[PDB]
């Protein structure tokens, strides 16, 4: 309701769900502490409707646990306190870094104060030419750009297993989450 959100964005199949699964992985990973029920469940309900016409209608259903969860979707909270993971497939080449640009424009517009951590997944199945092209494109075309979010860090990981690289990303998500929350309290 009040606490900070982590927004994981990128194109479908980039490895967002896989990455989160590994980031949360311990003994107590996904299901742990507090609620006996999911706070917000979002599912499509396709209905072969018949009111006047015989058309097809899909409703995007938001199932809220209670007041705290509904309050958390206030336009203020969605747009404000949020650290963004911008995720892309390293193995599909530097064209995927170009594909992050429209995402960064969309994040800046939606959440003007929100920092971004760039995560390149599929490190294990990328060649060093792809990694070199992606690295150079990030440093020259994405980092410290007026109209883009502040990119606090950028990582290249295999999102399917625990590694030193993933453990560092996890540490960075923690540190950048704590920092952002109370960071830049005033403006001169």
Ligand X SMILES: Nc1nc2c(ncn2[C@@H]2O[C@H](COP(=O)(O)OP(=O)(O)O)[C@@H](O)[C@H]2O)c(=O)[nH]1
| Residues found near ligand X in the complex (CB under 6 A) | 10, 12-18, 37, 65, 121-122, 124-125, 158-160
Q: How far is the CB of 31 from Mg ion (least distance, A)?
A: 15
- CA dist., res. 170 & res. 53, Å (int): 51
Instruction: State the binding partner of 119 from ligand X, Mg ion, its own copies, none, CB within 5 to 8 A by kind.
Output: none
* Sites for its own copies among residues 108-137 (CB under 8 A): 110
- CA dist., res. 169 & res. 125, Å (int): 19
Helices 164-182 and 16-23 cross at an angle (nearest 10°) of: 90
Q: How far is the CB of 119 from its own copies (least distance, A)?
A: 13
Question: Rule CB under 5 A: is residue 17 a binding residue for Mg ion?
Answer: yes
Q: Which of 90, 124, 154, 174 binds its own copies (CB under 8 A)?
A: 174
**Alpha carbon distance, N-terminus to C-terminus of the chain:** 30
Q: Which range in 118-126, 142-150, 158-166, 171-179 contacts its own copies by CB under 8 A?
A: 171-179
Q: Which DSSP symbol is given to 91?
A: G
- CA dist., res. 123 & res. 109, Å (int): 30
């Amino acid at each position: 309701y009040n606490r900070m959100k982590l927004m994981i964005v990128g194109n479908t199949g980039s490895g967002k769900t896989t990455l989160l699964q590994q980031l949360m992985k311990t003994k107590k990973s996904d299901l742990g502490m507090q609620s006996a029920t999911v706070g917000i469940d979002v599912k499509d309900w396709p209905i072969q409707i018949r009111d006047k016409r015989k058309r097809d209608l899909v409703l995007n259903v938001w199932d809220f646990a209670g007041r705290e969860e509904f309050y958390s979707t206030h336009p203020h909270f969605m747009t404000q306190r949020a650290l963004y993971l911008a995720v892309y497939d390293l193995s599909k080449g530097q064209a995927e870094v170009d594909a992050m640009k429209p995402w960064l424009f969309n994040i800046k517009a939606r959440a003007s104060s929100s920092p971004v951590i760039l995560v390149g997944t599929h490190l294990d199945v990328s060649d060093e030419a792809q990694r070199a092209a992606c690295m150079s494109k990030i440093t020259k075309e994405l980092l410290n750009k007026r109209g883009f979010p502040a990119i606090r860090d950028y990582h290249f990981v295999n999102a399917t297993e625990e590694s030193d690289a993933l453990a560092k990303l996890r540490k960075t998500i923690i540190n950048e989450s704590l920092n952002f929350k109370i960071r830049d309290q005033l403006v001169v």
